[PDB]
Symmetry: C3
């Protein structure tokens, strides 16, 4: 719907940007730039945190009537956010491995 | 609905616990504890397997009328389970890498 | 529905095959076969690309009436595709690490 629909687009874009930043963070690690990787990861998380917070309000205050479940719309947003958050967390682990290797 | 709704909560919690155990398993690997990591991974999988089995019954025996597809509710459960299973599988790979590194 | 339902099954199978190929690609890397890993990854991506293209047509040309959003059915397909694509991308990163790790 109006906002919910426009809000989802923002969430999808935000989630996509989060992943983009995360992959970029990893790329920095490959170049041996741990400092930039850490900075990129930190920002990536903040983007996700804000996105997750918005989704939480939706999931909690969404359902007009009773039930708390979710909606077709929310599920789509959750899919992007869940994927992005997971990607970012795993990417963080991958970056840590690069540090252990040396570079 | 009654059970389905309560069942989903259990699945979501179970999926979340699965991931939690998986991340913890990885943490053990970082401490150089391959034995504990393996034990944690094994338990993580068992939790997922039981969760997946419940979802399968849902997906197969859910749809009251004809169609086998899924439902708004099932999709949400699948999202958590799919994310958790994938996370756990990737985490397993990450742990194996730690073993190859040494520690 | 008829096609959409049958199309989803194809997408789910394709997504599953994509992941299967990706994991197999990783396995090749463990055996120290970077050439086979690369070949498997390339094919995995092509499978996903074709799958993603089909989903795009669905998401863009699906909704019979106005709205572009998604449908219960599409979300399910997106879940598998999103999971598979992410898995494959992360697996690619994991394979690159194996190459850096010698073998």
């Amino acid at each position: 719907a109006e906002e919910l629909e426009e809000v989802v687009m923002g969430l999808i874009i935000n989630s996509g940007q989060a992943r983009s930043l995360a992959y970029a963070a990893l790329k920095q690690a490959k170049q041996g730039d741990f400092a930039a990787a850490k900075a990129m990861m930190d920002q990536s998380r903040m983007a996700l945190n804000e996105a997750h917070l918005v989704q939480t309000k939706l999931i909690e205050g969404d359902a007009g009537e009773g039930k708390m479940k979710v909606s077709l719309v929310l599920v789509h947003a959750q899919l992007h956010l869940m994927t992005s958050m997971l990607a970012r967390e795993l990417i963080t682990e991958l970056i840590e491995l690069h540090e252990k290797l040396k570079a």
